[PDB]
Design a protein around this ligand. Structure first.
Ligand SMILES: C[C@@H](CI)CCC(=O)[C@@H](C)[C@H]1C(=O)C[C@H]2[C@@H]3CC=C4C[C@@H](O)CC[C@]4(C)[C@H]3CC[C@]12C
Length: 422
């Protein structure tokens, strides 16, 4: 079936009709095979660093070289601002990865595989052509299934750049059959001793009537630094993927747009320019994604995503209804059986590399809680960001601002990991 036959197929009409009775759980969407992705959501974590050089760039900016690492402003006022510029550029560079990859590789957004609890995805950017980079490692874990929650860490030891975060969504259909999505979660980025707090934006999926789904971003993302500096990024559709970002000396100033130290505008999936107090800031079309190195299937542990979903992926690619349904049930029995074995060997398969910390004022007696100087508390306080499980970017005293549970990477658990290698 050619894609121009999709919107009026029986399958698609049947799909749309069942939206009317949508039960609130996206995984139960009865999507036709042609709209299915063979990729699991635990793989989406790789999309935070597909431009390794931009990921690592802030670690190379110091007091003695900063004017030489600010292409759009050679008289940038400080290394702190030069690094905030660089973090903003990196963040803008992830968006195309995050939100357009299925478009390019599959032809539209397609329904992802709902990962099983304890599913794992790992790989590395080896950065062989730039020895000063060193290897950057991605760990990604399905820390919850009901609701689905993915947690991840991307880390470069050589340059002391690490990122961690987690992601969850809530979604509902509007009466025009547009799917509105709010993201939940945040990501933190340490560049040596300096820290950055990033909130993903709300989004909507369009082109559903026409059976050509695509993501458009809306609302705002924040990037708050331990330096006090704050970038606010506002998205809209257009003609697409446009935005306007502003960087402020601090979060009090962000209340007044004319206080912006710089202003960036354009398309995150194309080009954008910047003005101070214009030049090319980022051109997504000039800078190809670099895909992480994943180990061969034959060498994968059966918890690992591509190994786990192999037969399911093969059946989706064939578009075979029966075979998909059958491979899915065998996957479920394999994973149940796999967990039993983890358990017999004394292996914790559930909170494997990340733990759920309780930031509420009423933790349970033995619960994991934040230590005094916690990076998240200090950056959320700088931004006036709610520390509860509200939609990402929710500010203190917003309507949405309920638990305060956050996933945090524990490096030691990966250093003493019992099975999984890179
Ligand atoms: C194909 C659709 C037809 I109506 C079915 C709806 C789904 O497939 C939803 C669940 C799916 C998509 O439409 C886009 C997906 C988001 C795309 C990118 C991100 C970025 C990443 O960092 C975290 C995951 C997230 C939010 C995806 C979640 C699942 C979405 C909404």
């Amino acid at each position: 079936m050619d894609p121009s036959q999709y919107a009026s197929s029986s399958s698609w009409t049947s799909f749309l009709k069942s939206i009317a009775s949508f039960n609130g759980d996206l995984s139960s969407l009865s999507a036709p095979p042609f709209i299915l992705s063979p990729i699991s959501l635990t793989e989406f974590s790789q999309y935070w660093a597909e431009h390794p050089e931009l990921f690592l760039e802030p670690s190379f900016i110091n007091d003695d070289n900063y004017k030489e690492h600010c292409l759009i402003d050679p008289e940038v006022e400080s290394p702190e601002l030069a690094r905030m510029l660089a973090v903003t550029k990196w963040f803008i560079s992830t968006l195309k990865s995050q939100y357009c990859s299925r478009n390019e590789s599959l032809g539209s957004e397609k329904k992802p595989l709902n990962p099983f609890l304890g599913e794992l995805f790992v790989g590395k950017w080896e950065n062989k052509e730039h020895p000063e980079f060193g290897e950057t490692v991605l760990l990604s874990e399905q820390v919850s299934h009901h609701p689905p929650v993915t947690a991840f860490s991307i880390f470069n030891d050589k340059n002391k750049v690490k990122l961690q975060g987690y992601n969850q969504i809530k979604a509902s259909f509007t009466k025009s059959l547009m799917l509105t999505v709010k993201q939940f979660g945040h990501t933190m980025l340490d560049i040596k001793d300096e820290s950055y707090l990033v909130t993903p934006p709300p989004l909507h999926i369009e082109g559903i009537l026409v059976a050509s789904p695509f993501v458009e971003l809306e609302g705002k993302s924040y990037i708050q630094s331990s330096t006090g500096l704050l970038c606010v990024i506002e998205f809209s559709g257009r003609g697409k993927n446009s935005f306007k970002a502003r960087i402020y000396k601090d979060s009090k100033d962000s209340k007044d747009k004319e206080k912006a130290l710089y202003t960036i505008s354009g398309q995150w999936s194309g080009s954008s320019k910047i003005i101070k107090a214009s030049r090319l800031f980022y051109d997504a079309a000039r800078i190809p994604a670099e895909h992480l190195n994943v180990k061969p299937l034959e060498e994968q542990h059966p918890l690992e995503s591509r190994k786990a979903w192999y037969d399911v992926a093969g059946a989706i690619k064939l578009g075979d209804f029966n075979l998909i349904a059958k491979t899915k049930t065998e996957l479920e029995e394999t994973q149940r059986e796999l967990r039993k074995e983890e358990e017999a060997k004394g292996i914790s398969w559930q909170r494997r590399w990340f733990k759920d910390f309780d930031y509420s004022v009423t933790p349970e007696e033995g619960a994991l809680v934040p230590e005094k100087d916690d990076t998240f508390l200090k950056l959320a306080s700088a931004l006036n960001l709610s520390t509860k499980n509200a939609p990402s970017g929710t500010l203190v005293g917003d309507k949405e601002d309920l638990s305060s549970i956050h996933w945090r990477f524990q490096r030691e658990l990966w250093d003493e990991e019992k099975e999984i290698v890179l």
